[PDB]
């Protein structure tokens, strides 16, 4: 047969995760996309992002260590 019995432990929490436990990245490489501004502007994408709130958003990647901040550049 394919009946399976579960055992549950419920006396106390074994751990507490962050409300932000399920969080997301944007790869640092996406700041080298010409269309970067259009992409994060997207109303549609904002809707999807808001659905995962609360979350950390990590801006990071391989390219993290090849990105230089230019106070001048437009």
């Amino acid at each position: 047969q394919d009946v399976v019995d579960l055992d549950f432990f419920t006396q106390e929490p074994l751990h507490l995760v962050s409300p932000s436990f399920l969080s997301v990245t944007i790869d640092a490489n996406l700041a080298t996309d010409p269309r970067f501004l259009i992409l994060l502007g997207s109303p549609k994408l904002r809707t999807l992002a808001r659905g995962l709130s609360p979350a950390y958003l990590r801006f990071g990647g391989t390219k993290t260590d090849f990105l230089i901040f230019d106070p001048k550049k437009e």
Binding site: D7, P13, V17, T47, G51, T64
Partner: protein
């Protein structure tokens, strides 16, 4: 990999995306800007810090990504001790800034193989005191070689346990009690596995990763990526959500922060995988004391799960995910309790509708599927 500059404009786009989406931005600083004697040259970062504080930007920080492969990536070797020192320098600059309580996370090392274990242990001896969380990265497979069989293999899922135990071994021996985060995690590195990382098949690894992360004491999991060129994106090129977006939204609405335990009676306990948390109380439909069970069936037949005393006759809502055909586990579309999940419009996520089960009935979970079950009126004190 060549250098590239980015503008205040980019910092502004990123920050308003995060801000307007209700997400907490973490920004990784270039750690390969060095001085003559391979110390971290911090003047560029000092600029970005200034600009950000001027604009009123509430931001958390990282320094470097996968320092363990800087030699391969840039023919520079930095050891853990130096990197720890580099992190103390950054902490200083943050303390002397306008958000002096800004969080610092690191060191975003790859999975704990001997060289990486050594790097992380020496990083934490030296810089451990100034980080608010230890970040490390995990991937199950190489995106170039991964197969559909690998995505369905419980021997592949199980490897993650060992990785987690190795990280906790380094941390307990250098900084007992420090929070441990997955800072970048996915099915497969190299941008994901074409026709696999973006499909319903990807959900076995993702839901299992979440279940085991919670159970084993990981406080935060960061999914490579929300959006991007990578096959492992939650959202595709046309800003349409893939099956992992929906899995993620379901998890987010149903699963609480209080982690419990579930297990199967028997010696085969590899293909049927079970996780138990307190129900997310912010879920308007549920009340204090309710349980969320979630379960992965990698058997090739339906299994029928029986709740133990005193939960055997409780009202249960099922949230079963199943691919929309014709492409089976390789589908990019998913159904919740037989209803296809689609945005209502660009502004509107649909409802996520329960299927109340007959009280006392066993929990049917079809072959190659995953489901949530909410045990209504469980009255578990540890949850209340």
């Amino acid at each position: 990999f060549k250098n590239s500059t980015y503008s205040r404009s980019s910092v502004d786009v990123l920050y308003t995306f995060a801000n307007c989406s209700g997400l907490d931005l973490i920004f990784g600083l270039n750690a390969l800007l060095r001085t003559a004697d391979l110390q971290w040259n911090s003047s560029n970062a000092q600029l970005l810090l200034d600009y950000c504080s001027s604009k009123g930007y509430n931001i958390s920080w990282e320094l470097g990504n996968e320092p363990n492969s800087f030699l391969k990536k840039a023919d520079i070797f930095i050891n853990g001790s130096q990197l720890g020192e580099d992190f103390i320098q950054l902490h200083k600059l943050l303390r002397k800034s306008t958000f002096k309580n800004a969080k610092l996370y690191g060191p975003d090392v790859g999975q704990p193989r001997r060289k990486t274990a050594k790097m992380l242990k020496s990083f934490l001896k030296a810089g451990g005191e100034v980080i608010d969380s230890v970040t490390w990265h995990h991937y199950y497979l190489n995106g170039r070689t991964a197969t559909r069989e690998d995505f369905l293999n419980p021997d592949v899922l199980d490897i993650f346990i060992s990785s987690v135990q190795k990280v906790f071994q380094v941390v307990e021996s250098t900084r007992p009690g420090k929070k441990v985060w997955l800072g970048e995690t996915s099915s497969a590195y190299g941008g994901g596995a074409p026709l696999l990382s973006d499909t319903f098949a990807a959900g076995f690894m993702w839901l299992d990763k979440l279940g085991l992360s919670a159970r084993m004491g990981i406080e935060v999991v960061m999914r490579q990526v929300f959006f991007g060129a990578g096959n492992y994106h939650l959202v595709d090129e046309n800003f349409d959500p893939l099956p992992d977006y929906w899995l993620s939204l379901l998890f987010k609405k149903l699963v609480g922060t209080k982690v419990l335990m579930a297990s199967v009676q028997g010696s085969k306990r590899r293909k049927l995988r079970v996780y138990l948390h307190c129900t997310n109380t912010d879920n308007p439909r549920y009340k204090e004391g309710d349980l969320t069970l979630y379960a992965i069936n990698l058997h090739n037949v339906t299994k029928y799960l029986r709740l133990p005393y005193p939960f055997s006759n409780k009202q249960v809502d099922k949230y079963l995910l199943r691919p929309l055909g014709p492409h089976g586990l390789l589908s990019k579309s998913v159904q919740l309790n037989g209803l296809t999940l689609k945005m209502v419009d660009d502004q509107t996520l649909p409802p996520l509708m329960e299927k109340p089960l007959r009280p006392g009935s066993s929990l049917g979970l079809p072959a190659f599927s995953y489901s949530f079950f909410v045990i209504r009126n469980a009255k578990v004190a540890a949850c209340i």
